[PDB]
Design a protein around this ligand. Structure first.
Ligand SMILES: *[C@@H]1O[C@H](CO)[C@@H](O[C@@H]2O[C@H](CO)[C@@H](O[C@@H]3O[C@H](CO[C@H]4O[C@H](CO[C@H]5O[C@H](CO)[C@@H](O)[C@H](O)[C@@H]5O[C@H]5O[C@H](CO)[C@@H](O)[C@H](O)[C@@H]5O)[C@@H](O)[C@H](O[C@H]5O[C@H](CO)[C@@H](O)[C@H](O)[C@@H]5O[C@H]5O[C@H](CO)[C@@H](O)[C@H](O)[C@@H]5O)[C@@H]4O)[C@@H](O)[C@H](O[C@H]4O[C@H](CO)[C@@H](O)[C@H](O)[C@@H]4O[C@H]4O[C@H](CO)[C@@H](O)[C@H](O)[C@@H]4O[C@H]4O[C@H](CO)[C@@H](O)[C@H](O)[C@@H]4O)[C@@H]3O)[C@H](O)[C@H]2NC(C)=O)[C@H](O)[C@H]1NC(C)=O
Ligand SMILES: *[C@@H]1O[C@H](CO)[C@@H](O[C@@H]2O[C@H](CO)[C@@H](O[C@@H]3O[C@H](CO[C@H]4O[C@H](CO[C@H]5O[C@H](CO)[C@@H](O)[C@H](O)[C@@H]5O[C@H]5O[C@H](CO)[C@@H](O)[C@H](O)[C@@H]5O)[C@@H](O)[C@H](O[C@H]5O[C@H](CO)[C@@H](O)[C@H](O)[C@@H]5O[C@H]5O[C@H](CO)[C@@H](O)[C@H](O)[C@@H]5O)[C@@H]4O)[C@@H](O)[C@H](O[C@H]4O[C@H](CO)[C@@H](O)[C@H](O)[C@@H]4O[C@H]4O[C@H](CO)[C@@H](O)[C@H](O)[C@@H]4O)[C@@H]3O)[C@H](O)[C@H]2NC(C)=O)[C@H](O)[C@H]1NC(C)=O
Ligand SMILES: *[C@@H]1O[C@H](CO)[C@@H](O[C@@H]2O[C@H](CO)[C@@H](O[C@@H]3O[C@H](CO[C@H]4O[C@H](CO)[C@@H](O)[C@H](O[C@H]5O[C@H](CO)[C@@H](O)[C@H](O)[C@@H]5O[C@H]5O[C@H](CO)[C@@H](O)[C@H](O)[C@@H]5O)[C@@H]4O)[C@@H](O)[C@H](O[C@H]4O[C@H](CO)[C@@H](O)[C@H](O)[C@@H]4O[C@H]4O[C@H](CO)[C@@H](O)[C@H](O)[C@@H]4O[C@H]4O[C@H](CO)[C@@H](O)[C@H](O)[C@@H]4O)[C@@H]3O)[C@H](O)[C@H]2NC(C)=O)[C@H](O)[C@H]1NC(C)=O
Ligand SMILES: *[C@@H]1O[C@H](CO)[C@@H](O[C@@H]2O[C@H](CO)[C@@H](O[C@@H]3O[C@H](CO[C@H]4O[C@H](CO[C@H]5O[C@H](CO)[C@@H](O)[C@H](O)[C@@H]5O[C@H]5O[C@H](CO)[C@@H](O)[C@H](O)[C@@H]5O)[C@@H](O)[C@H](O[C@H]5O[C@H](CO)[C@@H](O)[C@H](O)[C@@H]5O)[C@@H]4O)[C@@H](O)[C@H](O[C@H]4O[C@H](CO)[C@@H](O)[C@H](O)[C@@H]4O[C@H]4O[C@H](CO)[C@@H](O)[C@H](O)[C@@H]4O)[C@@H]3O)[C@H](O)[C@H]2NC(C)=O)[C@H](O)[C@H]1NC(C)=O
Ligand SMILES: *[C@@H]1O[C@H](CO)[C@@H](O[C@@H]2O[C@H](CO)[C@@H](O[C@@H]3O[C@H](CO[C@H]4O[C@H](CO[C@H]5O[C@H](CO)[C@@H](O)[C@H](O)[C@@H]5O)[C@@H](O)[C@H](O[C@H]5O[C@H](CO)[C@@H](O)[C@H](O)[C@@H]5O)[C@@H]4O)[C@@H](O)[C@H](O[C@H]4O[C@H](CO)[C@@H](O)[C@H](O)[C@@H]4O[C@H]4O[C@H](CO)[C@@H](O)[C@H](O)[C@@H]4O)[C@@H]3O)[C@H](O)[C@H]2NC(C)=O)[C@H](O)[C@H]1NC(C)=O
Ligand SMILES: *[C@@H]1O[C@H](CO)[C@@H](O[C@@H]2O[C@H](CO)[C@@H](O[C@@H]3O[C@H](CO)[C@@H](O)[C@H](O)[C@@H]3O)[C@H](O)[C@H]2NC(C)=O)[C@H](O)[C@H]1NC(C)=O
Ligand SMILES: *[C@@H]1O[C@H](CO)[C@@H](O[C@@H]2O[C@H](CO)[C@@H](O)[C@H](O)[C@H]2NC(C)=O)[C@H](O)[C@H]1NC(C)=O
Ligand SMILES: *[C@@H]1O[C@H](CO)[C@@H](O)[C@H](O)[C@H]1NC(C)=O
Lengths: 154, 98, 142, 213, 95, 242, 119, 97, 154
């Protein structure tokens, strides 16, 4: 177990660690999704305007743009998803959806004190998108209930 | 390197034929049939995997040093001599004829 | 055993000029080590051939003319690996042996030679798991 | 052990039965976590309970746990023929080895009965070629296991050379034993009738083999 | 009226094998802008002075150098840089 | 899926040294502690120590802190979440009453108040510390015997005699036949020797056709025996059907 | 589908040489490895050597080391093989052969039509 | 370098075979400095093996797949074109030379 | 009225339906804004690196990039707007702004049980951006009031 300042530097640092221990490092994985791995000892000037010639159409030029856009392309998908689950701006979000033993019948400690996330995500590999569908179906049945409430509410 | 057993064995269109092949060291084992005029056509290559246009009749099997090749519903169009390949090493060969 | 010059020789460029050095000397064999009283051992020199009009990657890409560098040139590289290929057929089981020869056909092997220790993965930040925490007005009695 | 659990407890099939564990303030119980193992003698144990309240994976809710300030307990309900083994408790901390209990053997009352399947064999030619010949008798598939032996050569109580084994439980959940008789081929030829009789809940069945009768 | 619910975590430390576009980063030590390189072009982003290599404790990962898109990526980059570099240069066909 | 396999049985002079093995498989080795427990002669079970394959952190009971020596090998990765590993225990200056069944057991959890807790136990490894020498199993075959002759059933087997120390591992038909087999225990005779019997319950029909062979072995005396059971019975007990 | 059309089988005499071509189609001639497997009366199908048409890289079978010479015109996509010091025993029908895929040469799904040389 | 949300994994095993598990891994965003050397038979100016010299192949038995050797200690090779060749510019218009 | 799982598939499925009924389908319209229309029976591998040649500069290559970036370009505008209205991560967000009869004087049911959204948005077509301006002006008068509060609050 390391310090709060090291946690920031340790991208994928709780990969082989137990699922419960991984939660201190949620932010550091998130930050990587757009900015890549964090830099400590050196922090150069990352501002705009570094293309002073026709170099934006070269091999690397195109490649970089593709990598830049893909990076945000993907980030938004993850956000939009969390959004339509009603978990916007939450690194840990409780839902209305009850867990299913068919998905997994492990106790808290059988998971959180015994499994790594990739290990567990491999167990839930099959039932994942279906859950993603319930998460979203829940959110709707919530929005429905609100309009329901706005009707009785004069 | 490959002792393709048996030596030679021809039989009727009804009886289901079986050809085996011994193995020295590990490696993908395939089979080919040399029909009249034609080239040795690939029939079974990885072991249990069939080639392009090969019917269910042909079926490969077995684990370890030996490896089998089985076909029922034989025909005059299924005549010719077979071969057992491993890497660049071939086997003796076994045939079905008149 | 054969092929384009670049494949049947050691090819590279020093300061821009492209070389084709006869690796025959490097592969005579000399396997049994006696050392001969540490004699007959200085440098081993390979005849090199030099060419200017040059086409890499075969068909993809055009032919290039390498302009000559004026004056004599010499570069030193460090040999960090080799690309070999085995002659394979049935031979004397006891006590026979296999022979190896150099190959340089596909440049991808040069790239595999350095990249072997790397792989790229995609990160999957979303994760889902059971918990005794419900939504709305409850997080288990509070 | 210092941590003393009960000697032996009796339970009734279908219902429950409890096992207690206790010792001085050191080995128990406050600020000490308690576990439970079923430990079928001759086989590797099985963890039933580990955090007193908590059950191991795949364990039935039948088995339940409770620890008071001075004692640990272990309820085991819907009793079965497999629960006739001996169980163990243990007191441990988050960073210290287990302090196993004294052990508790369990009896599951009100279960069916079975009769000892005897199979008497003669001393083979190899034995008779020594010359040292021994008889081989073996009872199996019987319970309750509380049985007793009585060999009879010409209806006489035999003493020297007669070795019996203590009855062991089986995969058939029943108890089984075995007894021998070491003599010479000269004695074997002959002393009337060499009988192998054994008793169980009154039923004293006999399976005999002799060289003349 | 339940016991356990789906709980959603963002920033979860998981990865899967993947093929993607890779851009280039150069050591930027090439002072001379005049004498510019065919592979380390101006489009290569400047290197990090400190290359941060994070040890993945408790992680065992399978590799296979013989099925690695990186080399095909690297290979096609190489031959594309070589082509782009003589694209502006003078044709010698009168010879 | 996990699996801990211990070493074979050993017979040691009192005052001698010995090292017990524990080869793991099916799970990540360094993820869990390996424990050591022994079943004493008259002291029941007895946790000796545990050790972390990952950190090397040991915890030895005061009793053995200067008697046994817990050590481990480095894990060999098989899959992303499985690895082979080996754990050891050298209990030197072997006193008496050390004769018993020695167990290794992997931990329960990876983080919590019960991480090291023995969950997956091994096979055991019976130790016999003694002056007494070693003696092999005098294997003889048992003739066929029909118990319920009205139906036609019967039983055959092999008798193991005059050996020490325990144990003896029997098998049938080169280690293939499993149905009807039944290995009984044994007792300490006056001399000191042990003696068991293994029965495989099969009728008197497939006698002259099917083969039955007892594959007996004894690791302490290092013997491996194969015996053919003779299909013959000159007695009034079985001779009814024919 | 791919196909490997071949030359006509010439008539030869011992102590001489022969050259038999093989034109490929339907695939990138360079990307995949081509072999030469001849078939004589009764003997196991004899592989002589593979040819990687990238840089003419080759690998000949031991008994044929010295006589065999596999080349290619990467422009006409033609595969060439010369065989000097002829014998009545090395007489056979010749088949240029490429594998199932470029990841493995030894599953010869694609054979060329036989070329019959007579000695 | 990989895009954001992606990462490169570097095998730090000192006696690595190429395929299979790696006990010692480390994530990086960028590959270390790799010089694009184009050479044949001999691999020049590259990375030596940490443990000892290494042989790698998809399967050695398949003779049709290249053996890739990695030395532990490098071997200097010094090549040269020793002649003092003077060069001339030959122009053909407009200024093309 | 269809099922919760069908709701997910029915993009623009409550287009001709009444405004009150459209609320169960809010998430499904949102998800389309970045990922387009959802796919059910088939879900292929949409990962990166499918451009293995100089095809990124062709007709379709450029077109795709334009469509990819425009898609997120627009998504953010809608988000940033909701954000400066104080409705971040809300599919239904209450405001402080009172409704104006001049905008519309229909009762709840006169709207929600009688109109489709496009129908209604056509009625409010004129007064929309002005509302968008009030929504934003409200948010500011809120932020002002907070700083006001931070001043008295020592
Ligand atoms: C592997 O690896 C290895 C290693 O790494 C490698 O090798 C390498 O290589 C490299 C490359 O090639 C190299 O480098 C090079 O070199 C060279 C030489 O040097 C020298 O000299 C110089 C000068 O020069 C001059 O002289 C010479 C002789 O000497 C000649 O040859 C030349 O040509 C020139 O001439 C001139 O003059 C004259 C008079 O004299 C006249 O006549 C004429 O006309 C002209 O004018 C010098 O400078 C140098 O010096 C250096 O060194 C020293 C020591 O030795 C020091 O003292 C000094 O300072 C210097 O150093 C520095 O740096 C370093 C680093 O580097 C450091 O360490 C130090 O400290 C310092 O800082 C000598 O002495 C040269 O020349 C070159 O340069 C060039 O190149 C580059 C690139 O590479 C660049 O950058 C520059 O700028 C230049 O450029 C040029 O060229 C190019 C091509 O080449 C081009 O592209 C450009 O654009 C330009 O061009 C121009 O010019 C030319 C001429 O030059 C012409 O042709 C054109 O047309 C235009 O006009 C470089 O530097 C090295 O050396 C090597 N090394 C070894 C060890 O070997 C290899 O390669 C590899 N391999 C593989 C396979 O990869
Ligand atoms: C197999 O193949 C292999 C590869 O294919 C073969 O490898 C080759 O092996 C050869 C030897 O076997 C190697 O040859 C060695 O070369 C060096 C070169 O140093 C000289 O050049 C330096 C830079 O160039 C200047 O000089 C050249 C030549 O004159 C000019 O052309 C340049 O223009 C440039 O000119 C400047 O300098 C001059 C003055 O020299 C000025 O007038 C100009 O205006 C310019 O300013 C240069 O730095 C060196 O200068 C030092 O040495 C001078 C004397 O030579 C001295 O006057 C200088 O003051 C200076 O000394 C001071 O500065 C240095 C700076 O580092 C300090 O370290 C030093 O202490 C002083 O403070 C030099 O001009 C050459 O030096 C070597 O000579 C040594 O080895 C030979 C071997 O026969 C010995 O016999 C010599 O005694 C000598 O030993 C020295 O070291 C001893 C200690 O170890 C010491 O005790 C001695 O007293 C002595 O100082 C070699 O000749 C060749 O490089 C190599 N090639 C490659 C690619 O590897 C291999 O041979 C082959 N084998 C077989 C079996 O086939
Ligand atoms: C590229 O090049 C590479 C090489 O560089 C190629 O790689 C290999 O490719 C092959 C396939 O092409 C892979 O598959 C292996 O196939 C083996 C074939 O086994 C058969 O033949 C043997 C012949 O001896 C036979 O024993 C086997 O049957 C036995 O088991 C059954 C079930 O019990 C029984 O019914 C039989 O009668 C046999 O058992 C009797 O006989 C035994 C004789 O020794 C007795 O010991 C036994 O008690 C009984 O009396 C079978 O018919 C197969 O064996 C291989 O299994 C390996 O590897 C597996 C992983 O792939 C692993 O899961 C297995 O457990 C086994 O591992 C063994 O060795 C390691 C060594 O450390 C141990 O750690 C293991 O625990 C295990 O050993 C124990 O178990 C043994 C059996 O009980 C026992 O003898 C031993 O003492 C230990 O107790 C494979 O499945 C092969 O994996 C590839 N790699 C290698 C390295 O070989 C590759 O193909 C090529 N590429 C291409 C495209 O071709
Ligand atoms: C391929 O071909 C290549 C070309 O031929 C070939 O390249 C050459 O290889 C050699 C190696 O064989 C290169 O290195 C040389 O090594 C000699 C031995 O090095 C030992 O000494 C080092 C320094 O020791 C300091 O500390 C000691 C502590 O007591 C002192 O006693 C020393 O006096 C010295 O003092 C320090 O402190 C002083 C304080 O007052 C200070 O002044 C002084 O400058 C210095 O800082 C040790 O570090 C080293 O040991 C290390 O490694 C071992 C394990 O290997 C560890 O156990 C140790 O703990 C330690 O980490 C060695 O014991 C050097 O003598 C030789 O000196 C040159 O460099 C020094 C500066 O370092 C110069 O001052 C000096 O003039 C020498 O010339 C250099 O400069 C000139 C002018 O610029 C230049 O022309 C010349 O080429 C050279 O660079 C040198 O370091 C050699 O440099 C390579 N040459 C080239 C051109 O590349 C290659 O090997 C071939 N490879 C193959 C595979 O074939
Ligand atoms: C990679 O994989 C590996 C393997 O899976 C992972 O390692 C695992 O990490 C977890 C969590 O760190 C471990 O669980 C913990 O185990 C310890 C065991 O205690 C041992 O160490 C004690 C000291 O620990 C410090 O020192 C060691 C170096 O030795 C450091 O490595 C540690 O980090 C600590 O800084 C030591 O005191 C103990 O020894 C005893 O006996 C010896 C011999 O007689 C004496 O010398 C000692 O004095 C002592 O008497 C012992 O050897 C537990 O202590 C932990 O329990 C605490 O935390 C639990 C929750 O996590 C909680 O349930 C416990 O009750 C306890 O709670 C703490 O807080 C309470 C708050 O009220 C306190 O009241 C309480 O007293 C206590 O302070 C925990 O169970 C795994 O064992 C470990 N796995 C292995 C195989 O070792 C690793 O995490 C993975 N990831 C990475 C990135 O590496
Ligand atoms: C820590 O997590 C691992 C999983 O990575 C747990 O291991 C798993 O345990 C179960 C039994 O508890 C093993 O078998 C199961 O069997 C039942 C039938 O009896 C079957 O229905 C299940 O699907 C499952 O197969 C399972 O194989 C095993 N997994 C592995 C990879 O070994 C482990 O138990 C957890 N630790 C604790 C203390 O709970
Ligand atoms: C999750 O559920 C499976 C069954 O779906 C559990 O399997 C147990 O297997 C043992 C084997 O002896 C049975 O006795 C139990 O009755 C089974 N339990 C159930 C609930 O059926 C498995 O143990 C459970 N836990 C894990 C971690 O997989
Ligand atoms: C190897 O070839 C080199 C060529 O430079 C020569 O000097 C050497 O004598 C040769 N050795 C043998 C054993 O042929």
């Amino acid at each position: 177990a390391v310090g709060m300042g090291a946690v920031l530097l340790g991208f994928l640092g709780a990969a082989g660690s137990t699922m419960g221990a991984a939660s201190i490092t949620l932010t550091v994985q998130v930050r990587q999704l757009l900015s890549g791995i964090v830099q400590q000892q050196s922090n150069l000037l990352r501002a705009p305007e570094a293309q002073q010639h026709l170099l934006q159409l070269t091999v690397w030029g195109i490649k970089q743009l593709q990598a830049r856009v893909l990076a945000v392309e993907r980030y938004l998908q993850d956000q939009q998803l969390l959004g339509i689950w009603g978990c916007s701006g939450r690194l840990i979000c409780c839902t209305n959806v009850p867990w299913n033993a068919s998905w997994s019948n492990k106790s808290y400690s059988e998971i959180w004190d015994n499994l790594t996330w990739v290990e567990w995500e491999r167990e839930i590999s099959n039932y994942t998108q279906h859950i993603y569908n319930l998460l979203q179906e829940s959110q709707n049945q919530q929005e429905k209930n609100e309009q329901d409430l706005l009707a009785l509410d004069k | 390197v490959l002792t393709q057993s048996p030596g030679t064995l021809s039989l009727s269109p009804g009886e289901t034929a079986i050809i085996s092949c011994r193995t020295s060291q590990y490696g993908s084992l395939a089979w080919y049939q040399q029909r009249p005029g034609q080239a040795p056509r690939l029939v079974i290559y990885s072991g249990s995997t069939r080639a392009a246009g090969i019917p269910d009749r042909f079926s490969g099997s077995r684990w370890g040093p030996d490896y089998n090749l089985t076909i029922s519903n034989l025909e005059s169009g299924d005549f010719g001599v077979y071969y057992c390949q491993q890497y660049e090493f071939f086997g003796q060969g076994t045939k079905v004829q008149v | 055993s054969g092929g384009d010059l670049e494949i049947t020789t050691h090819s590279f460029n020093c300061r821009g000029e492209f070389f084709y050095c006869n690796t025959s000397g490097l592969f005579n064999t000399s396997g049994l080590f006696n050392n001969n009283s540490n004699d007959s051992s200085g440098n081993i020199t390979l005849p090199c051939k030099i060419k200017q009009i040059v086409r890499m990657w075969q068909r993809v890409g055009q032919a290039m003319y390498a302009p000559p560098i004026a004056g004599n040139i010499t570069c030193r590289s460090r040999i960090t690996g080799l690309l070999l290929v085995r002659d394979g057929c049935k031979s004397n089981e006891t006590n026979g042996t296999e022979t190896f020869r150099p190959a340089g056909g596909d440049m991808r092997d040069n790239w595999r030679s350095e990249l072997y220790k790397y792989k790229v993965v995609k990160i999957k930040p979303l994760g889902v798991a059971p918990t005794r925490c419900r939504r709305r007005v409850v997080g288990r009695r509070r | 052990s210092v941590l003393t659990q009960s000697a032996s407890v009796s339970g009734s099939l279908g219902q429950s039965v409890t096992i207690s564990c206790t010792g001085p303030n050191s080995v128990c119980c406050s600020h000490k976590s308690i576990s439970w193992y079923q430990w079928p003698p001759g086989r590797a144990p099985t963890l039933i309970i580990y955090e007193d309240n908590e059950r191991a994976p795949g364990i039935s809710p039948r088995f339940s746990g409770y620890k008071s300030y001075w004692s640990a307990y272990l309820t085991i309900s819907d009793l079965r023929p497999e629960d006739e083994t001996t169980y163990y408790c243990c007191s441990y901390t988050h960073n210290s080895g287990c302090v196993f209990g004294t052990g508790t053997k369990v009896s599951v009352l009100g279960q069916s009965k079975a009769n000892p399947s005897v199979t008497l064999f003669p001393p083979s030619s190899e034995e008779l070629q020594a010359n040292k010949a021994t008889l081989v008798c073996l009872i199996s598939d019987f319970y309750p296991g509380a049985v007793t032996v009585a060999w009879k050569a010409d209806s006489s109580p035999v003493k020297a050379g007669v070795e019996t084994t203590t009855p062991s439980k089986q995969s058939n959940n029943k108890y089984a034993a075995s007894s021998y008789l070491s003599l010479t081929p000269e004695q074997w030829k002959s002393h009337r009738s060499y009988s192998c009789q054994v008793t169980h809940e009154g039923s004293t069945v006999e399976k005999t083999v002799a060289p003349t009768e | 009226a339940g016991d356990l619910w789906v709980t959603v975590y963002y920033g979860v430390p998981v990865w899967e094998d993947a093929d993607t576009t890779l851009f280039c980063a150069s050591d930027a030590k090439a002072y001379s802008t005049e004498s510019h390189n065919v592979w380390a072009t101006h489009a290569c982003v400047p290197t990090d002075p400190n290359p941060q290599e994070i040890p993945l404790k408790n992680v065992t990962e399978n590799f296979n150098m013989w099925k690695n898109n990186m080399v095909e990526q690297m290979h096609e980059d190489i031959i594309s840089l070589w082509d782009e570099s003589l694209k502006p240069c003078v044709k010698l066909t009168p010879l | 899926q996990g699996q801990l396999v211990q070493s074979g049985a050993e017979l040691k002079k009192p005052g001698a040294s010995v090292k017990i093995s524990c080869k793991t498989s099916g799970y990540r080795f360094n993820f869990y502690h390996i424990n050591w427990i022994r079943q004493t002669a008259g002291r029941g079970p007895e946790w000796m120590g545990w050790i972390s394959p990952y950190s090397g952190d040991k915890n030895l009971a005061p009793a053995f802190q200067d008697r046994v020596i817990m050590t481990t090998d480095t894990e060999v990765p098989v899959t992303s979440f499985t690895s082979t590993g080996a754990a050891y225990m050298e209990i030197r200056n072997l006193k008496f009453d050390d004769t018993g069944t020695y167990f290794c057991a992997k931990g329960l959890l990876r983080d919590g108040s019960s991480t090291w807790l023995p969950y997956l136990w091994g096979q055991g490894t019976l130790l016999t510390v003694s002056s007494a020498s070693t003696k092999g199993p005098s294997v003889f075959p048992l003739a066929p015997s029909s118990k319920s002759t009205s139906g036609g059933t019967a039983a055959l087997g092999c008798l193991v005699k005059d050996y020490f120390p325990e144990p003896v591992t029997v098998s049938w038909n080169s280690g293939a036949l499993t149905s009807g087999v039944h290995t009984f225990p044994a007792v300490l005779q006056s001399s000191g020797l042990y003696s068991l019997s293994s029965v495989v319950t099969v009728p008197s029909s497939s006698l002259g056709t099917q083969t039955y062979i007892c594959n007996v072995n004894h690791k302490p005396s290092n013997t491996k025996v194969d015996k053919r059971v003779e299909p013959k019975s000159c007695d009034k007990g079985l001779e009814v059907l024919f | 589908q791919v196909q490997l059309v071949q030359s006509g089988g010439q008539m030869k005499k011992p102590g001489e040489s022969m050259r038999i071509s093989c034109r490929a189609s339907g695939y990138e001639f360079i990307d995949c490895t081509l072999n030469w497997i001849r078939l004589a009366p009764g003997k196991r199908p004899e592989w002589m050597g593979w040819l990687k048409p990238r840089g003419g890289a080759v690998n000949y079978c031991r008994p044929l080391q010295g006589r065999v010479t596999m080349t290619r015109d990467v422009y006409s996509d033609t595969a060439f093989l010369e065989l000097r010091s002829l014998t009545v025993d090395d007489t056979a029908v010749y088949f240029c052969t490429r594998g199932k895929n470029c990841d493995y040469n030894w599953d010869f799904e694609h054979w060329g039509r036989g070329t019959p040389v007579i000695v | 370098c990989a895009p954001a949300g992606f990462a490169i994994l570097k095998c730090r095993d000192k006696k690595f075979n190429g395929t299979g598990p790696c006990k010692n891994v480390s994530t990086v965003q960028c590959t270390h400095g790799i010089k694009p050397v184009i050479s044949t038979q001999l691999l020049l100016n590259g990375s030596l093996a940490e443990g000892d010299i290494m042989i790698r192949s998809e399967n050695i038995t398949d003779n049709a797949k290249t053996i890739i050797v990695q030395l532990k200690t490098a071997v200097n090779i010094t090549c040269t074109r020793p002649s003092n060749n003077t060069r001339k510019s030959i122009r053909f218009g407009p200024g093309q030379a």
